[PDB]
Every structure is written in C-alpha cells, then in structure tokens.
Coordinates of C-alpha atoms in Angstrom, one line a residue:
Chain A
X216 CA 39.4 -7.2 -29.7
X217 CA 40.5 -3.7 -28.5
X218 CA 40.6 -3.1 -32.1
X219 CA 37.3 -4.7 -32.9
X220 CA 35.9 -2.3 -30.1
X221 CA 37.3 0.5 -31.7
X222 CA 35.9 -0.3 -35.3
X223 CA 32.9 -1.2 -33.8
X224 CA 32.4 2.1 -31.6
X225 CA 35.1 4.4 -32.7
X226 CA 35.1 4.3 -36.6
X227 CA 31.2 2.7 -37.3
X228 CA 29.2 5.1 -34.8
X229 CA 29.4 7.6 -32.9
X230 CA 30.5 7.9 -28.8
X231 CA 29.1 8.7 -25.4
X232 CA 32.3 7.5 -23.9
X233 CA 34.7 10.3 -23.4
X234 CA 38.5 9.1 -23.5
X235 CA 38.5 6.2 -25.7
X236 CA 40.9 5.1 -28.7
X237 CA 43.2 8.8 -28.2
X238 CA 42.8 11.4 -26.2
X239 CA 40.8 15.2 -25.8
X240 CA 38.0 14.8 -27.7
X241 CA 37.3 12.7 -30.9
X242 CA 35.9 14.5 -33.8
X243 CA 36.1 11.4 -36.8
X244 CA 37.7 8.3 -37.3
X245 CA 39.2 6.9 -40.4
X246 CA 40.1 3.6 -41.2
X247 CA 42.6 2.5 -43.6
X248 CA 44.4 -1.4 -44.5
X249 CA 47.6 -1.3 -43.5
X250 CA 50.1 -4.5 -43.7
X251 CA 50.2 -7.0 -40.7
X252 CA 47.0 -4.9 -38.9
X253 CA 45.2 -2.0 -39.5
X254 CA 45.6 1.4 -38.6
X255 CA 43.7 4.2 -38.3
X256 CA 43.9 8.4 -38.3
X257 CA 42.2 9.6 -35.0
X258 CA 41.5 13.3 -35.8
X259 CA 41.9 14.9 -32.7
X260 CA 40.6 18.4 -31.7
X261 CA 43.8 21.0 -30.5
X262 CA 43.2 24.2 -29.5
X263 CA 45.5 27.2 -30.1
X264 CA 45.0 30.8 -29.3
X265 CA 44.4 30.4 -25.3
X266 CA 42.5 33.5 -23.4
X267 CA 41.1 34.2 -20.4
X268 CA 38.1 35.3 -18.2
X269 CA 36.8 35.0 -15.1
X270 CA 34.3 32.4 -13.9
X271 CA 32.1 31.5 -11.0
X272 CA 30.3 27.6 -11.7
X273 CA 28.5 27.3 -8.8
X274 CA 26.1 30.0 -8.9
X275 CA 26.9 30.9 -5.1
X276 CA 27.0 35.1 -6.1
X277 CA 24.3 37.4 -6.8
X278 CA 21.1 35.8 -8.0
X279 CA 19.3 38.3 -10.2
X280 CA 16.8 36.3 -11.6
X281 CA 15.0 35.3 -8.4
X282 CA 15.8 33.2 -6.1
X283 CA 18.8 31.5 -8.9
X284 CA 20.7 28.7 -7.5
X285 CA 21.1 27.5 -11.0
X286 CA 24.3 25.0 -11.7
X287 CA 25.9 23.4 -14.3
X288 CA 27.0 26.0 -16.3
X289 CA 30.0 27.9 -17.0
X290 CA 30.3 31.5 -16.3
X291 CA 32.3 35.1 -18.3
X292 CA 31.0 38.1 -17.4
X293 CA 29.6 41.4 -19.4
X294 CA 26.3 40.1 -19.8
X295 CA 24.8 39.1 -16.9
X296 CA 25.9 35.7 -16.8
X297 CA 26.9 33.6 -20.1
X298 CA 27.9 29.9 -20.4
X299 CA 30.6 28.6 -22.8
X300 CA 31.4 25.2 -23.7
X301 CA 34.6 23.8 -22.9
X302 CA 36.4 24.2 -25.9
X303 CA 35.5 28.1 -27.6
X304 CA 35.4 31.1 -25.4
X305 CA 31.1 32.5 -25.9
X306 CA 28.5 34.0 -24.7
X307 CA 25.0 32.3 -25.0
X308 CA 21.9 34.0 -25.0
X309 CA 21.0 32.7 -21.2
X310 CA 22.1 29.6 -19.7
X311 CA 20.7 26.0 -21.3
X312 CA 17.6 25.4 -19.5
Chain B
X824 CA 77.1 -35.6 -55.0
X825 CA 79.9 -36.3 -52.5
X826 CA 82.6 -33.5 -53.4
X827 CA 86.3 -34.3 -51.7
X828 CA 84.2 -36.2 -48.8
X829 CA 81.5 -33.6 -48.3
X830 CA 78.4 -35.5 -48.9
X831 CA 75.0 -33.3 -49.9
X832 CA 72.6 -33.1 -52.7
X833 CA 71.5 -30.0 -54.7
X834 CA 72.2 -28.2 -58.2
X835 CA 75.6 -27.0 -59.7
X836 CA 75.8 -23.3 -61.4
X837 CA 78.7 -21.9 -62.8
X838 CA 79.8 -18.7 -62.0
X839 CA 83.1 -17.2 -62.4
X840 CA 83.8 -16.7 -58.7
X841 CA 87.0 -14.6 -57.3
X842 CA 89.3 -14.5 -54.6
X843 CA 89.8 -18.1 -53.5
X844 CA 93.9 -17.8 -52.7
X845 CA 95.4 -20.9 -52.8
X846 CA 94.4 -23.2 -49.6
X847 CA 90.7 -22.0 -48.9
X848 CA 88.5 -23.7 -51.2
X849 CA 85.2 -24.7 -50.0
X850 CA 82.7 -21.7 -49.4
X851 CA 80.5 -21.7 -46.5
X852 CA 77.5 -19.4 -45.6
X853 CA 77.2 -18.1 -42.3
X854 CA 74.6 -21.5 -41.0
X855 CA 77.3 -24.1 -41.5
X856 CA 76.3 -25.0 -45.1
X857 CA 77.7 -25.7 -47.8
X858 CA 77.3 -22.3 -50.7
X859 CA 80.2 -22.8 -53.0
X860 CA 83.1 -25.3 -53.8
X861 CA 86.1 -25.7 -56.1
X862 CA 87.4 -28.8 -58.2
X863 CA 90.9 -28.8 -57.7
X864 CA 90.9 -30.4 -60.5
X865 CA 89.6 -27.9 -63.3
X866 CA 90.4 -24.8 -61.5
X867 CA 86.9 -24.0 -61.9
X868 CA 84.0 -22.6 -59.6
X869 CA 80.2 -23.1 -58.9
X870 CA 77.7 -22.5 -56.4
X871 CA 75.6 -24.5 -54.7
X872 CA 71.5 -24.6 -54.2
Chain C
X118 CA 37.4 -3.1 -50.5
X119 CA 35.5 -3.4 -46.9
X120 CA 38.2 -0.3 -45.7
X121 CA 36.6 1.4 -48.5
X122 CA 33.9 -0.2 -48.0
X123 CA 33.8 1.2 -44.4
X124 CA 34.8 4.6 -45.1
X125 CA 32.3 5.0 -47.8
X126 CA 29.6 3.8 -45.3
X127 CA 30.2 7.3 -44.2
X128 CA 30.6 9.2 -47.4
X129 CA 27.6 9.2 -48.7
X130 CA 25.8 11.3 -46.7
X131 CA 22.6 10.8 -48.7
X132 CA 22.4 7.4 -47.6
X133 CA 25.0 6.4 -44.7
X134 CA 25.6 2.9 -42.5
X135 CA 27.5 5.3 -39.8
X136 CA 24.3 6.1 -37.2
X137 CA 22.0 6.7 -40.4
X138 CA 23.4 10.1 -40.1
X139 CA 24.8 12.3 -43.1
X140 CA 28.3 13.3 -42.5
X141 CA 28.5 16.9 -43.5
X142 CA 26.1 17.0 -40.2
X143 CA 28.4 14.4 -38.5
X144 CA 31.0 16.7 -37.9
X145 CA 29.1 19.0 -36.3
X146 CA 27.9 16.7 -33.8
X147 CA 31.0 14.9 -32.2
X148 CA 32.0 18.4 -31.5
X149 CA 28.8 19.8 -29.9
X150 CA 29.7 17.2 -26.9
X151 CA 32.3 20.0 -26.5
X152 CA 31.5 22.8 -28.8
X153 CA 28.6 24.3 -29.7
X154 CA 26.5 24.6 -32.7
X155 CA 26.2 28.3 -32.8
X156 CA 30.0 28.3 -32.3
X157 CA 31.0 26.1 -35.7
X158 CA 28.4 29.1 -37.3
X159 CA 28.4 26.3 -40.4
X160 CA 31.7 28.9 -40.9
X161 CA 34.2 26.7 -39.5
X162 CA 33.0 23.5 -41.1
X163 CA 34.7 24.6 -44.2
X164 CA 37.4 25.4 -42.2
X165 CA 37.5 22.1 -40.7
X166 CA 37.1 20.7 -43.6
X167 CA 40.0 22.6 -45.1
X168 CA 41.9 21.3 -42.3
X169 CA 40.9 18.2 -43.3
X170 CA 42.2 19.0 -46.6
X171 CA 45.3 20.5 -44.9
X172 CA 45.4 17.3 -42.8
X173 CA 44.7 14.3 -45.7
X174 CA 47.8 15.9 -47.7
X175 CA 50.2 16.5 -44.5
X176 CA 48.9 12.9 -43.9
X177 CA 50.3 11.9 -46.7
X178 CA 53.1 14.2 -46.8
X179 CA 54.2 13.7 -43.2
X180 CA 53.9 10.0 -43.7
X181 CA 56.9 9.4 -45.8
X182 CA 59.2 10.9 -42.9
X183 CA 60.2 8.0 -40.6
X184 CA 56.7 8.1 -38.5
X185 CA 55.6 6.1 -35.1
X186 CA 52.6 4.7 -37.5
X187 CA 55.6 3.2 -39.7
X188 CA 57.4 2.7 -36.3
X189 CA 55.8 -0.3 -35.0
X190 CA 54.9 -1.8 -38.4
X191 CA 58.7 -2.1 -39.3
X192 CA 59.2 -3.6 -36.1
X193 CA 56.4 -6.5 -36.0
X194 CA 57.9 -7.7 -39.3
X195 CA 61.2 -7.8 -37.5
X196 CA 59.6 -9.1 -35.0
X197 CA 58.8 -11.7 -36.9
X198 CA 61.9 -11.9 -38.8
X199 CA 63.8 -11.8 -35.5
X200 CA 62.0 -14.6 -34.4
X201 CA 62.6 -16.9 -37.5
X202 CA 66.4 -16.2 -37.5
X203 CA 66.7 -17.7 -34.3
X204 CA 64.5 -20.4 -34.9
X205 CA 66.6 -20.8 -38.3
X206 CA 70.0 -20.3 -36.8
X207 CA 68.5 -22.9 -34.4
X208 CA 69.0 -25.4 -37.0
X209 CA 72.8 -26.0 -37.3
X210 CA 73.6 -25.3 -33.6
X211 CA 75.4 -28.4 -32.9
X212 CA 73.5 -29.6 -29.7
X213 CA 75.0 -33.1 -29.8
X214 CA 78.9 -33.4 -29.8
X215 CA 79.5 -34.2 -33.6
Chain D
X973 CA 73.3 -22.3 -16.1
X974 CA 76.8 -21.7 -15.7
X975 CA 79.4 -21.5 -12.9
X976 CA 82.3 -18.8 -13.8
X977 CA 84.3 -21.8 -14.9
X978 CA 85.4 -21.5 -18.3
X979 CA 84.9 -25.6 -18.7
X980 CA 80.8 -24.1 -19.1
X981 CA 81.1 -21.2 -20.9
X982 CA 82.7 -23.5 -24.0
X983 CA 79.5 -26.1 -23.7
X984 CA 77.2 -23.3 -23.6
X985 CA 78.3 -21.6 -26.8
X986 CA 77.0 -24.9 -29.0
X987 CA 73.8 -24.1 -27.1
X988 CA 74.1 -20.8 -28.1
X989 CA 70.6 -20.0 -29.7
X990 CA 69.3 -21.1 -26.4
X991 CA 70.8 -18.2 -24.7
X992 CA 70.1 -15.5 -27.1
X993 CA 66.4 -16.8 -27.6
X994 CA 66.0 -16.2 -23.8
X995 CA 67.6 -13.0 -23.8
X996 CA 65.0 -11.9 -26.6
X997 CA 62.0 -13.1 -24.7
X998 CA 62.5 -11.3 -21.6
X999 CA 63.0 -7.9 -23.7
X1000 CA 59.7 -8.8 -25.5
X1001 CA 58.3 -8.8 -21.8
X1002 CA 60.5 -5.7 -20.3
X1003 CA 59.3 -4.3 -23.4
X1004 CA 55.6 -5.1 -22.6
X1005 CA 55.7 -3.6 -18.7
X1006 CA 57.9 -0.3 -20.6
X1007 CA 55.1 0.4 -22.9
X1008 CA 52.3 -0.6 -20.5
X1009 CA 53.2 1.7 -17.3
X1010 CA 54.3 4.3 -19.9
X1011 CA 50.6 4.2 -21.1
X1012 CA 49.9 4.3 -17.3
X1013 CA 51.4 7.3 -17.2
X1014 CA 50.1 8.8 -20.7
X1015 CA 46.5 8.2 -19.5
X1016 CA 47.0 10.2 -16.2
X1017 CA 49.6 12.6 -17.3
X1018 CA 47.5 13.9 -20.0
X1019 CA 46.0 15.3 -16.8
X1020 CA 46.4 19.0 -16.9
X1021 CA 45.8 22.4 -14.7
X1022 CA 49.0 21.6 -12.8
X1023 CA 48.9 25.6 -12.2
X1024 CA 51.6 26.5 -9.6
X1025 CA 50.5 30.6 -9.1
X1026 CA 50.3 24.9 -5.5
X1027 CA 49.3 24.9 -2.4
X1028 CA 49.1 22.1 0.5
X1029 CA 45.9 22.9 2.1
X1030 CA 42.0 22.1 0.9
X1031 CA 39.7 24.6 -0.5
X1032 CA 37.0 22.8 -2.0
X1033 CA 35.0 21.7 1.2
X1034 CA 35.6 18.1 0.1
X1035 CA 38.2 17.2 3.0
X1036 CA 41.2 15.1 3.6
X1037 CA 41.8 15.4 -0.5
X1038 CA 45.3 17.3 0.6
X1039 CA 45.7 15.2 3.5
X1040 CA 44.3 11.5 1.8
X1041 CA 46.3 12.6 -1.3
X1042 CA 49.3 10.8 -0.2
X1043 CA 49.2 9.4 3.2
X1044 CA 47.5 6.4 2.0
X1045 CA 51.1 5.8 0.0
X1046 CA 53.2 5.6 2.8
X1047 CA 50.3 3.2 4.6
X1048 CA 50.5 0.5 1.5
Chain E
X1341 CA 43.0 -40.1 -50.7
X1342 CA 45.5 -42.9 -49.0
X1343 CA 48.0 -40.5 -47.4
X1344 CA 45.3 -37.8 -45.7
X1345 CA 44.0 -41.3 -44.5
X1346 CA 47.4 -42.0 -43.2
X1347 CA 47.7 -38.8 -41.2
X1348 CA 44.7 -38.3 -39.2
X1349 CA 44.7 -42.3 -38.3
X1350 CA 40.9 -42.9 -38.7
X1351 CA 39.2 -43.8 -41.8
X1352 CA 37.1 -41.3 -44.1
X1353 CA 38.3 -38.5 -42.2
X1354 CA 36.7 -35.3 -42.1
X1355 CA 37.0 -32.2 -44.1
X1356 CA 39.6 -29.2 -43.7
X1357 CA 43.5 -28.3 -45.0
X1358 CA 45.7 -31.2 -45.0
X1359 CA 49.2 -29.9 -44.6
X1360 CA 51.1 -33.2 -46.3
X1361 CA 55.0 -34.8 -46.0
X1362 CA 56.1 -32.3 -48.3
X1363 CA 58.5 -35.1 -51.1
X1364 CA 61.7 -33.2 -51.9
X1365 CA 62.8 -33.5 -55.9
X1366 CA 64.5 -37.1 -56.5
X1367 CA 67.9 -36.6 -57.7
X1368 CA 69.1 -38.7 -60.8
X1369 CA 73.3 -38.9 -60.7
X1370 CA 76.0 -40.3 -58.6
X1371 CA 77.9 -38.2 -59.9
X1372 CA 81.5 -37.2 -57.3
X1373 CA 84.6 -35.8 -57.5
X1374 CA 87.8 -36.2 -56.0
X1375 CA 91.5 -35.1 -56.4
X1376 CA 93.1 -37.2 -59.3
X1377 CA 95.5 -40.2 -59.1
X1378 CA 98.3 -39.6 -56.2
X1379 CA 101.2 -41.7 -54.9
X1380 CA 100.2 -44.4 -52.0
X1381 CA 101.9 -43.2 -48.8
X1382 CA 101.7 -46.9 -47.4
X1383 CA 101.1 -46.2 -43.5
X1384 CA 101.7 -49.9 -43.2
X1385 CA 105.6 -49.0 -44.2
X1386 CA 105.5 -46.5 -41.0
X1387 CA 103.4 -48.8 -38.4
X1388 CA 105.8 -52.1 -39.0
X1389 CA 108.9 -50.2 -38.9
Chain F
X951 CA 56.9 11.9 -20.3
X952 CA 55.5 14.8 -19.8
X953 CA 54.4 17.8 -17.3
X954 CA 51.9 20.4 -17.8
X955 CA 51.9 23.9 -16.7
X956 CA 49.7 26.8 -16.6
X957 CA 48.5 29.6 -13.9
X958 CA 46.4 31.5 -11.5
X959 CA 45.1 28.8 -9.1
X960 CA 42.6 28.4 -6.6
X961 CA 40.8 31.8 -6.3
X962 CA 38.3 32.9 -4.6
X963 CA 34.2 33.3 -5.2
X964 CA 35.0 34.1 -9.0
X965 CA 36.9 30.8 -9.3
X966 CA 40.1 31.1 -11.2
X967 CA 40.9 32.1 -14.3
X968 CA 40.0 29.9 -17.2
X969 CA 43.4 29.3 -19.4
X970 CA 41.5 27.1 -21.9
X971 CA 38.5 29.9 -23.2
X972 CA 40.2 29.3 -26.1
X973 CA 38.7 31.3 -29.6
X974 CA 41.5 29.6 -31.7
X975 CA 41.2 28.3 -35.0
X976 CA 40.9 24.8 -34.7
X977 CA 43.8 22.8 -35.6
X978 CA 43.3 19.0 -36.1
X979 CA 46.5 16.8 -34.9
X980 CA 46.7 13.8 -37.4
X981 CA 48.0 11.5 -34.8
X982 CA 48.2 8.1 -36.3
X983 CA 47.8 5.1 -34.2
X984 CA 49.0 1.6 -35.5
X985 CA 47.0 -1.5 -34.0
X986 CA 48.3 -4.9 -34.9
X987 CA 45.6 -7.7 -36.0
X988 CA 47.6 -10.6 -37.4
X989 CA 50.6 -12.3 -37.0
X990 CA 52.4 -13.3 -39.9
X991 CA 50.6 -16.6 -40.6
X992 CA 53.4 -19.4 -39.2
X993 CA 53.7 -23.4 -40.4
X994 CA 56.2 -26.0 -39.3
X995 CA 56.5 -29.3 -40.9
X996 CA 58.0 -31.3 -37.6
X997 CA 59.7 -33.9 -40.5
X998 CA 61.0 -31.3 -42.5
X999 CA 62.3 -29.4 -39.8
Chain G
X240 CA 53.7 12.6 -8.9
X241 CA 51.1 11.8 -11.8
X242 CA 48.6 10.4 -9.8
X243 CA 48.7 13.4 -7.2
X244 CA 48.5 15.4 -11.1
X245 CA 46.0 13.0 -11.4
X246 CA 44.3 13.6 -8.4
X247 CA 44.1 17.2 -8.2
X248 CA 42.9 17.4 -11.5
X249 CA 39.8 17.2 -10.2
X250 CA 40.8 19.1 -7.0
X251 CA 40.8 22.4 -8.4
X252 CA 36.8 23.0 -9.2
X253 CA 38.2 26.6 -10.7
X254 CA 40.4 24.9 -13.2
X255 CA 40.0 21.2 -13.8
X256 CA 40.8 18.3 -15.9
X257 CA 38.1 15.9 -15.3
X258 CA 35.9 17.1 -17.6
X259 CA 36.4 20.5 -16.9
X260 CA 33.3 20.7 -14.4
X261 CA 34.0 21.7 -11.3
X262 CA 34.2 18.9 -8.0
X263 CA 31.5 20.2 -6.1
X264 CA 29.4 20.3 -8.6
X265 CA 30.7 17.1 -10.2
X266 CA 29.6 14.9 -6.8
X267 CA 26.3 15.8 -8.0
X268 CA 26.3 14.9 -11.4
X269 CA 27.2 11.3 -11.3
X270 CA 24.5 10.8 -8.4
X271 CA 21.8 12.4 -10.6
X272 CA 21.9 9.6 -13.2
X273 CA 20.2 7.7 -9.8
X274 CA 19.5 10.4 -7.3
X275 CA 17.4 13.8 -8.0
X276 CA 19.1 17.4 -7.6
X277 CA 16.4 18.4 -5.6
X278 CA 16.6 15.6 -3.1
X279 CA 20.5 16.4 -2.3
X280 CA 19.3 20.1 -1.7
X281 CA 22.7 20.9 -1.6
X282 CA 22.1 19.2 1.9
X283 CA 23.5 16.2 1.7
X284 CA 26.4 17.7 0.0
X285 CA 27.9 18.1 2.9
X286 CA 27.0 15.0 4.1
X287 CA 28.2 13.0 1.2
X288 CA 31.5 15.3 2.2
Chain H
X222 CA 44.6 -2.1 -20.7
X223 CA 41.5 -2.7 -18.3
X224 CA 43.1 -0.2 -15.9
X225 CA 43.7 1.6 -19.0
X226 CA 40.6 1.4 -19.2
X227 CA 39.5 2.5 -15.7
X228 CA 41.8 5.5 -15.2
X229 CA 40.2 6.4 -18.7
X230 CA 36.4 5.9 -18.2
X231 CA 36.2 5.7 -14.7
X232 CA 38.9 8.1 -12.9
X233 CA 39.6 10.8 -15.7
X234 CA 36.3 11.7 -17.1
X235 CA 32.4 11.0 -15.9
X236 CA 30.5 7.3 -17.0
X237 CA 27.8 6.8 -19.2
X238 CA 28.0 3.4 -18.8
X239 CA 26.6 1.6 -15.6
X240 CA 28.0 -1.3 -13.9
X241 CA 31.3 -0.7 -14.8
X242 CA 34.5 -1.2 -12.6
X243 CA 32.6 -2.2 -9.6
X244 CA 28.5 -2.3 -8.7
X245 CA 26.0 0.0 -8.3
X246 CA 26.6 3.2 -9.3
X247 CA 29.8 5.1 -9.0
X248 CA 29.7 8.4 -7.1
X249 CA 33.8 9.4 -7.6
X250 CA 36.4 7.5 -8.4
X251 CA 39.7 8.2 -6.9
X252 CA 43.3 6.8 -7.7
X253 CA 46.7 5.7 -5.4
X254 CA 50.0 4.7 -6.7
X255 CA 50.7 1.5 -4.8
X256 CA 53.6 -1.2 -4.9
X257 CA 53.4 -3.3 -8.1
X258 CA 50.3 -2.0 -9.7
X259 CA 48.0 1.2 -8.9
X260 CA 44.7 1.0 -6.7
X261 CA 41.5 2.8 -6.6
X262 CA 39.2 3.2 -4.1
X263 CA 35.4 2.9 -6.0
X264 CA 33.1 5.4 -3.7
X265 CA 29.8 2.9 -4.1
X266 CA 26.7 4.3 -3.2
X267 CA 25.1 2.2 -0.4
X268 CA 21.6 2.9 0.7
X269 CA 20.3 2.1 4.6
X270 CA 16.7 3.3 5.6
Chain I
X258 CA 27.3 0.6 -51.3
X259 CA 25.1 1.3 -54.0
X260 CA 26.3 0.8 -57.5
X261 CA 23.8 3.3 -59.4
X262 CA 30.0 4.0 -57.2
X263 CA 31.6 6.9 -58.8
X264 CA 35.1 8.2 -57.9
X265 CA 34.7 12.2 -57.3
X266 CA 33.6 13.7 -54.3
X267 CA 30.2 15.3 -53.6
X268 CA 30.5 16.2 -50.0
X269 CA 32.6 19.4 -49.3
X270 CA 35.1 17.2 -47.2
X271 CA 37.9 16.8 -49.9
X272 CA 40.4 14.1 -50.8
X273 CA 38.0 11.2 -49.3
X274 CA 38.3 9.8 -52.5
X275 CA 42.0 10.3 -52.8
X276 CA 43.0 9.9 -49.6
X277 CA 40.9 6.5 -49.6
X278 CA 43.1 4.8 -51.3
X279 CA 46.4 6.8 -51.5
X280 CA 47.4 5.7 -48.3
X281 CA 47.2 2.3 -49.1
X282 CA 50.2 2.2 -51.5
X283 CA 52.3 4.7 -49.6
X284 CA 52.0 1.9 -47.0

C-alpha cells in the first residue's frame, strides 16, 4: 500500500507533497518489474557548485518602494532587491507579485 | 525395496560412485535420508531418488 | 507490459495518461516547485536530459556492481529460502524418541 | 527452556530446529526496529544547516526554542 | 467430481482452486537385497550353555 | 548515519549567508529504491507434509 | 542529537532546512491557508509568540 | 512509517494536505525524542471570541 | 497506448526506449 501510494502519486502524477517516496526534491519517477516486487529509480535533484550571498527575507530594511513590508521572498543584493528560488543562485526582474 | 533392513521406495541409477573404503557403505545426505547405497554383493553402486 | 505500459503513459508526450501533461514540459514543472522557469532557459533541459542519458547508462552500468537495489532482492529470496530450510530441516528432527 | 544441566542441553538438540527457528525470528524483528529507527533518523538527519560559526541562546523572537529544545527530555 | 466433493464436506460445492491429496507414483516390485548365504551362529547354543 | 556541516550562522539584519545559492550544473543521483510487493507464493499439503 | 538537528532546522530563519523559508515568516504561512496576512498585521505575531 | 510519515509531511517541510496528524489546521509542528518512541507536540489553532 | 507502438524515441529524453526494457533482464 506504501507502494500503491507511490505508483499512484509518485510515478502516475505529479506532487504537492514535498518529502515523499526519497528525499530533496523529486524531479521524475520511473518504474520498472523487478523479481519478488517492484522497484523504481527516484531521480533526485543534487546540487554541486555551492556559493554565497547575502540575504535579508523579512523585508525589515530599507523600503524603497513605498511604504514595502513585502515577505516571502528571498533576497541577493546588486539590484535593488532580487528573489531566487531555493535551488539556483538569480536575480528576478522584481519580486513575484 | 528393503536394502540390508533399510526399508524405502524410490528409483535405482547407476553411477560409478568413488571412495566408499571398506566399512562405510550406505550414503546419507545431510536430512537423514537415504542418497546412495552399496550391494555387498556386486561391488556395485547407485543412487537413490 | 503494464511497466511499459506505465512508463509509456508518460512517453508520449503528444498524448499522455501522466496529468494530461507532455513530458518534455513535465520536467520543467516538478522543478519550478524549486527552480525556476527562466532558470532551466529550455538550456538545461538538454542538459538534464543528457544527464538522463548520462544517468539511464550509469543505471545500467552501476547496476551490475553489487548495489543496495540488488541488496534487499537477494535477501527476500533468502529470506524465503531461509525460511523453507528450516521448515525443511524441520522434517527429520526426531521429536519423538525413535 | 533449559537449566545449565547438561541432561537438557542433549533433549534440546533433537528439538533443534525449534531453537534456531526462534533465533531467526527475533533477528527478523531486531532487524525490523534496526531499519525502522535508522529511517527515524534518515528522515530527520537529512536535516541540514547544522552551521557551527552554535550558539545556546534564541534569536529569532520565537522563545523558549533554546530553552524547550531539550528540557522537555529530561521531564519525560 | 467425487473427491472435490469429499474435501469441502457439502454437496455441489462452489467454484474456486481445489488443491487435491496429491497420489504418489505406485511402485510395481518387491524387489530386496540382502547379504548372501552365511553360517547360522545358533544363539540358542550360547543361551543354554 | 550521518552529520552535516556548513557555516556562518545566525547574523544579524542581513541574515546569514546562504551556502546553498548554488549555480551548479545539476547532477541527478540515480538512487534506486527496492519495494517488495509479493511473497514468494507458499502451499502446504498438511498429508503430504 | 538529531532531533535538536531537527529542531533547529527550522531555528535558524537565516539558514534553514524546513523548506528553506525562514521561521518567522514560516508561522505565517501555514496560518494563511485559514487566516489572512493582513489580519495577523505582524501583530499577533508576537502574540502567537 | 506513519511517523515516517509525520516527521516527513508534518515536521520537516509545510502541509498541503488538511486534517492530517491531528485536527484543525496545523500552525507548527515541533518534535521530542522520548523513551520508546518520539513525540510531537501538534500547535492546533483554537479559536475563542 | 495507441497502436497506430513503434520502438524509437521521439522525445529528446534518450534511452526511454532502451532503458524500458534493458533493465528488466539485467534484473
């Protein structure tokens, strides 16, 4: 049934769950017959080349655009603020909405 | 059959077998059963299924 | 055939029974929970997919080293066969006295 | 089931598929709680940021989290 | 159809996979062998001593 | 099992340095899992046995 | 040990391991599937604390 | 494997899912070792007024 | 699974028709 679950959710569609069937993220699923059960190849996402930069989530410095107690959004600097994703170090045009 | 007072049923193929010395005749598996005999008779071998 | 069956479901990204979606999209989507769109570029989709390439043959290359996927298969079959040797062995144990 | 006595030991070894088919069935279940709690473990230990540049007092304004970190152990 | 009948101990029984007795092959010889024609060592001459 | 280790905790307004702005090239770890679904399928005769 | 590395990795809102989103923020996200953003006002923030 | 579960889903990362590991909604989720078997302590949100 | 089934790949991400079945007999 733990296996059913995971061909049901992990290998037909797609997730909203987060650490299921592995660990980190889960980019596919595969599924192949194996003898006495079947197995499967869970394709997870591994990062390399770490770097660094600073960040400030919270918002709780220097509102330019006015009056900004904006949130949920990471933070590197050299723009004027940027968010990045959790996984590759970038800039976005502003923050998401 | 019933070979020198072991009783048992099964099939008889003959295979020139080795190394029985003089005194141990009857060959046993590991489980107690019976897996290979000689006729002192014939000076002949089998093994038993 | 319903392995292949169920991996093909997601191979024809034409016409697909994973989500209705096409899975040259697919990829990029189970990653923008954690990377972004713009990131990927469409530049490393062939490089995933190349890693995918790199991965399917070190799949099957690392598989024939002695692997923790092989691991617990050997063992359940011993498992098994453990189990049946004692319940064989059980056999001619002599409980009684004779 | 036995005493020390050797009088048992020799009675016991006709039984002895008994005592070998107990011995595997508490490994099958001391194998169970090994690769359970280990997966315990491998769910929360795959926890990162461990960063020790550690220290023992709160920062976030969230409060207790150093102090309710482990005193509720030594309560249970 | 008599020994399915035998098993589940209810006539007509219903449907399913009838695991059966199993009847071993019938063997066909009497067919033992002993060690050939020795001396009588007469107990009886060693009890009534 | 294991123990992780990184650096550069707990700063101040500008919290902390990110270790994981990572700009790699992705790898992807194979990782195999194994799930059982089915014994081996298991019969006993109670004659036979 | 691991459940203190459990623990604090969510302790350190610079660098965490619950999602990497920081705490303070994260006490507001799991309330605004039910409660509004606006309504904690960042008030009850340090209420909830 | 339901604790697997619930250090998973519930402690480690955020929910997506609703009324799971305990009613309501779930504001944190926190996590003790404790003799024979770990223990959590489910923040529900309760409302008064 | 419609028949009208061939055994190459169309979509860029290779070997998902070798690697369909190739692990199978490695197995």
């Amino acid at each position: 049934a733990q296996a059913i679950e995971k061909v049901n959710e992990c290998v037909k569609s797609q997730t909203t769950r987060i650490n299921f069937c592995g660990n980190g993220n889960h980019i596919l699923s595969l599924v192949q017959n194996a003898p006495y059960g079947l197995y499967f190849i869970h394709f997870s996402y591994v990062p390399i080349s770490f770097t660094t930069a600073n960040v400030s989530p919270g918002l709780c410095i220097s509102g330019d655009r006015g009056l900004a107690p904006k949130a949920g959004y990471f933070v590197q600097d050299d723009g004027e603020w940027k968010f990045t994703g959790s996984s590759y170090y970038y800039p976005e045009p502003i923050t998401d909405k | 059959y019933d070979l020198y007072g072991i009783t048992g049923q099964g099939v008889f193929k003959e295979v020139k077998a080795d190394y029985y010395n003089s005194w141990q005749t009857l060959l046993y598996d590991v489980n107690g059963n019976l897996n290979g005999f000689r006729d002192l008779t014939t000076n002949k071998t089998y093994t038993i299924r | 055939g319903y392995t292949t069956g169920a991996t093909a479901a997601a191979m024809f990204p034409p016409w697909s029974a994973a989500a209705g979606v096409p899975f040259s999209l697919s990829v990029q989507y189970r990653i923008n929970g954690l990377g972004v769109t713009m990131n990927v570029l469409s530049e490393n989709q062939k490089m995933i997919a190349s890693a995918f390439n790199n991965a399917l043959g070190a799949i099957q290359d690392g598989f024939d080293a002695t692997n923790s996927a092989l691991g617990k298969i050997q063992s359940v079959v011993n498992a098994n066969a453990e189990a049946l040797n004692n319940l064989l062995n059980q056999l001619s144990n002599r409980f009684g006295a004779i | 089931v036995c005493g020390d006595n050797t009088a048992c030991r020799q009675q016991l070894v006709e039984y002895g598929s008994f005592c070998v088919n107990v011995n595997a069935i508490l490994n099958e279940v001391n194998n169970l709680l090994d690769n359970m709690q280990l997966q315990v473990a491998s769910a929360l230990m795959q926890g990162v940021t461990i960063s020790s540049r550690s220290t023992c007092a709160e920062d976030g304004n969230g409060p207790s989290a150093i102090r309710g970190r482990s005193a509720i152990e030594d309560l249970l | 159809t008599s020994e399915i009948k035998c098993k589940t101990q209810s006539m007509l029984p219903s449907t399913g996979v009838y695991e059966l007795s199993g009847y071993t092959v019938q063997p066909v010889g009497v067919v033992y062998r002993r060690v050939a024609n020795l001396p009588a060592c007469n107990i009886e001459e060693w009890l009534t001593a | 099992p294991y123990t992780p280790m990184l650096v550069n905790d707990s700063v101040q307004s500008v919290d902390g340095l990110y270790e994981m702005q990572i700009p790699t090239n992705f790898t992807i770890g194979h990782h195999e899992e194994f799930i059982q679904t089915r014994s081996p399928k298991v019969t006993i005769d109670c004659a036979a046995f």
